[PDB]
Amino acid sequence: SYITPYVPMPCMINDTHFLLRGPFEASWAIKLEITDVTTLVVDTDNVANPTNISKCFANNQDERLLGFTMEWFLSGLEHDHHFTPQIICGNVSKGEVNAQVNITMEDHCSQVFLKMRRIFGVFKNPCTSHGKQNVLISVSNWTNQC
Ligand SMILES: *[C@@H]1O[C@H](CO)[C@@H](O)[C@H](O)[C@H]1NC(C)=O
Ligand SMILES: *[C@@H]1O[C@H](CO)[C@@H](O)[C@H](O)[C@H]1NC(C)=O
Ligand SMILES: *[C@@H]1O[C@H](CO)[C@@H](O)[C@H](O)[C@H]1NC(C)=O
C-alpha cells in the first residue's frame, strides 16, 4: 500500500482538546475540540460531508497541506457510507471555527472516538452520556504545546 507523507504530529491537551500539528513541523495545527456547544447553523452555502470537508479550509493559507492533513485524519471514516455526520463549514473571517461535526448519533460519536483513541490513546469516552455532541475543527498557531 501507499504511505502518505502528510502525517501530522498529534498531541492531546485533555479529554476534550486535541491538536494535530501540521506535517513537516508546520507553523500551524488543526485544533479539535469535543464540546456539546452548538456554534453553527445550517445555511444554503455551508453544508458539507466527509467527502468535501476540505472545502471548509478554502481561504486558508497552505490549504493544500491542510487538506492533506484532514485527509490523513479522516482515513477509514470517509470511505464508510454509514458515517454520515452533519458537517457545517464556518466563516473563519468572522471568527467562527473551520468546521462543526455533528456527532450526536451514538454510532458517529463512537466512530470518531475510536479514531481519536487510535491516534492519541486513552481518554474520556464522550458517547457514554447522551445529548448533543460536536467536534469543532479549527486552525490554530503552534506554540510548542508539547
Ligand atoms: C482543556 O484544555 C483547554 C485548553 O487549555 C481548557 O480551556 C479547558 O478548560 C481544559 N479542560 C479541562 C476539563 O481542564
Ligand atoms: C459537498 O458536496 C455536496 C453534495 O455532495 C454539496 O451539496 C455541498 O455544497 C458540498 N460542500 C461544499 C462546501 O461545497
Ligand atoms: C445535530 O444532529 C441532531 C440529530 O442528528 C439534530 O437534532 C441537531 O439539530 C443537529 N445539529 C444542528 C446544529 O443542526
Residue numbers in the entry: 75 to 220
Q: Which sentences did the original study use to describe this structure?
A:
The GP1 subunit of the envelope-displayed arenaviral glycoprotein spike complex (GPC) mediates host cell recognition and is an important determinant of cross-species transmission. Maturation of the GPC precursor involves proteolytic cleavage of the polyprotein into a retained and myristoylated stable signal peptide (SSP), a GP1 attachment glycoprotein, and a membrane-anchored GP2 fusion glycoprotein (1–5). We solved the crystal structures of the GP1 glycoproteins from Loei River virus (LORV), an Asiatic rodent-borne OW arenavirus of unknown pathogenicity in humans, and Whitewater Arroyo virus (WWAV), an NW arenavirus associated with spillover into human populations in North America. Both WWAV and LORV GP1s were solved at neutral pH (7.5 to 8.0) and acidic pH (5.6 to 5.0), permitting the first direct analysis of the effect of pH on the structure of GP1 in the absence of cognate GP2.
Crystals of WWAV GP1 were generated under two conditions, buffered to pH 7.5 and 5.6, and X-ray diffraction data were collected to 2.4- and 2.0-Å resolution, respectively. As phase determination by molecular replacement with existing arenaviral GP1 structures failed to yield a solution, the single-wavelength anomalous-dispersion (SAD) method was used for structure elucidation. Crystallographic analysis of WWAV GP1 revealed the characteristic α/β fold that has been observed for other NW arenavirus GP1 structures, as well as in OW arenaviral GP1 glycoproteins in GP2-associated states, comprising a seven-stranded β-sheet with three α-helices positioned on the convex side of the molecule. WWAV GP1 structures determined at both neutral and acidic pHs are nearly identical (0.4-Å root mean square deviation [RMSD]), indicating that exposure to acidic endosomal pH, and subsequent shedding of GP1 from the GPC, is unlikely to induce conformational rearrangements to the molecule. Overlay analysis revealed that while the independently reported WWAV GP1 structures were essentially identical and exhibited an RMSD of 0.9 Å, minor structural differences were observed in loop 5 of the glycoprotein, indicating inherent flexibility in the region or a requirement for the quaternary architecture of the GPC for stabilization. Despite utilizing a common receptor, WWAV exhibits a low level of sequence conservation with other NW arenaviral GP1 glycoproteins with known structures (e.g., 24% and 25% identity to clade B JUNV and MACV, respectively), reflective of its classification as a clade D NW arenavirus. Consistent with a low level of sequence conservation with JUNV and MACV, WWAV GP1 exhibits significant structural variation throughout the α/β fold (2.3- to 2.5-Å RMSD). Comparison of our WWAV GP1 with other NW arenaviral GP1 structures revealed that while the NW arenaviral GP1 scaffold is structurally diverse, especially in loop regions, it adopts a single conformation that is independent of pH or the presence of ligand.
